């Protein structure tokens, strides 16, 4: 095929922003202050990119799974791509609903080649603002 | 046929296994720098070229600031994970 992805479809696609700021205190996770600026920054940035943005706020881990099952079971046939923006607490391969953890591979596998055939050969981006561990990069001087 | 795991791109805020920082007033370093570079270069740069300037931004323009000495003066480098098979431009033809 081409040297580049075909982006001249009717739509650019779906941009799903998942913004979890407040977490149940049974998790020990704290309020994520400043995430409202991020989610509102992303909505505008992709609004100029001609994306159909959908902000989704304080979703439980089960609400994250079932939304991505519904998004993946859509006719993306008229869309150039699928963007997904996750903003939450994190471990490696783990994203946090407001009540517990999700596996990053759970969410993404809904959109694979054999599962979301409306999005086969179509760029599926995933932006993950979340910790991947507890190691501190202290830096170095040049 | 194509594989089932191609054309996946994973932009990570921090390196694998590390802490990801966020400002309490402005927002996360990553989404901050990503929106700035997307708003600035989506007209002219390929996506992976936009995503590396996001890396230069978080790596150099940012540093942590905390009253806790344990979490102070810490850096962050993003992590691009591309299973993409072609280039990605947000402008057309």
């Amino acid at each position: 095929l081409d040297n580049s992805y075909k982006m001249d479809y009717p739509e650019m696609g779906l941009c799903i922003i998942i913004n979890n700021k407040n977490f149940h205190k049974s998790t020990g996770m704290t309020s994520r202050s400043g995430t409202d600026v991020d989610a509102a920054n992303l909505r505008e940035t992709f609004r100029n990119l001609k994306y159909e943005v959908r902000n989704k706020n304080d979703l439980t881990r089960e609400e994250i799974v079932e939304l991505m099952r519904d998004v993946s079971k859509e006719d993306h046939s008229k869309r150039s791509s699928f963007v997904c923006v996750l903003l939450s607490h994190g471990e490696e391969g783990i994203i946090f609903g407001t009540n517990g953890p999700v596996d990053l591979k759970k969410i993404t596998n809904f959109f694979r080649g054999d599962r979301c055939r409306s999005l086969t050969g179509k760029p599926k981006l995933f932006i993950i603002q979340a910790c991947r561990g507890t190691e501190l990069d202290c830096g170095i001087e040049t | 046929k194509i594989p089932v795991e191609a054309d996946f791109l994973y932009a990570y805020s921090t390196a694998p296994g590390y802490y990801s920082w966020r400002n309490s007033k402005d927002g996360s370093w990553f989404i901050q720098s990503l929106c700035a570079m997307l708003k600035q270069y989506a007209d002219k740069l390929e996506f992976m070229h936009i995503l590396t300037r996001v890396n230069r931004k978080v790596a150099t323009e940012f540093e942590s600031f905390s009253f806790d000495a344990t979490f102070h003066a810490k850096k962050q480098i993003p992590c691009i994970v591309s299973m993409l098979t072609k280039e990605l431009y947000f402008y057309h033809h």
């Binding site: 994190g90 | 966020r22 905390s66 979490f71």
Partner: peptide, 5 residues
């Protein structure tokens, strides 16, 4: 101030 996720 800056916080870890």
């Amino acid at each position: 101030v800056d916080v870890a996720d």
